């Protein structure tokens, strides 16, 4: 599923991401824009042989099982395919564990390089929320 900007903002807010660990809703919408272009089916292979999955590009080295990432963990206790669903529940629940791990949203390199320190509230401007 390819979400609209305000459509995804509304879904993330319903699933409890707005101000989760102190990160306002526009931080989460900005991260999804630059990780996936709001496409739940996005996948990308990393140099280390791990793969990133879904709207927030969650990694198979730590967080999900894909059967092809040696010596990896599955700390979200989910198949990586669950992260590609039109239903964002699995991606949201796993993102809540990641952002609680100690480095906050710096876990997402695209958030640190494209969203951090910017006017992230622009990503929810105009939206009925
Ligand atoms: Cl957009
Ligand atoms: Cl915001
Ligand atoms: Cl594996
Ligand atoms: Cl933090
Ligand atoms: Na894994």
Describe the structure.
It is a single chain. This protein has 4 helices and 3 strands; from the N terminus they run ααβββαα. With 129 residues, it is mainly alpha-helical. The protein has a single domain, classed as Lysozyme (Orthogonal Bundle). The protein has a 3-stranded antiparallel β-sheet. The two termini are 21 Å apart. The relative contact order is 0.21. The structure holds chloride ion (CL) (4 copies) and sodium ion. Keywords: Allergen, Antimicrobial, Bacteriolytic enzyme, Disulfide bond, Glycosidase, Hydrolase, Secreted, Signal. Monomer.
Order of neighbouring strands in the sheet with most strands: 1-2-3
Structure class? mainly alpha
Biggest β-sheet description: 3 strands, antiparallel
Strand content range: 5-15%
Q: Bound small molecules, which ones?
A: chloride ion, sodium ion
Could you give the topology of this structure?
Blueprint lengths: L4 H10 L10 H12 L6 E3 L5 E3 L4 E2 L29 H11 L9 H7 L14
Antiparallel strand pairs: 1-2, 2-3
Helix pairs in contact: 1-2, 2-4
The protein binds chloride ion (4 copies) and sodium ion.
At a glance:
The protein is mainly α. The chain has helices at 5-14, 25-36, 89-99, 109-115; strands at 43-45, 51-53, 58-59. It has a three-stranded antiparallel beta sheet.
């Amino acid at each position: 599923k390819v979400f609209g900007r305000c459509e995804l903002a509304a879904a993330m807010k319903r699933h409890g991401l707005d101000n989760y660990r102190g990160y306002s809703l526009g931080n989460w919408v900005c991260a999804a824009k630059f990780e996936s272009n709001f496409n739940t089916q996005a996948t990308n292979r990393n140099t280390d042989g791990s793969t990133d999955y879904g709207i927030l590009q969650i990694n198979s080295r730590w967080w999900c099982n894909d059967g092809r990432t040696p010596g990896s963990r599955n700390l979200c206790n989910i198949p990586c395919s669950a992260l590609l669903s039109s239903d964002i529940t699995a991606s949201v629940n796993c993102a809540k564990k990641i952002v609680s791990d100690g480095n906050g949203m710096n876990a997402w390199v695209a958030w640190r390089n494209r969203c951090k320190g910017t006017d992230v509230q622009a990503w929810i401007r105009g939206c009925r929320l």
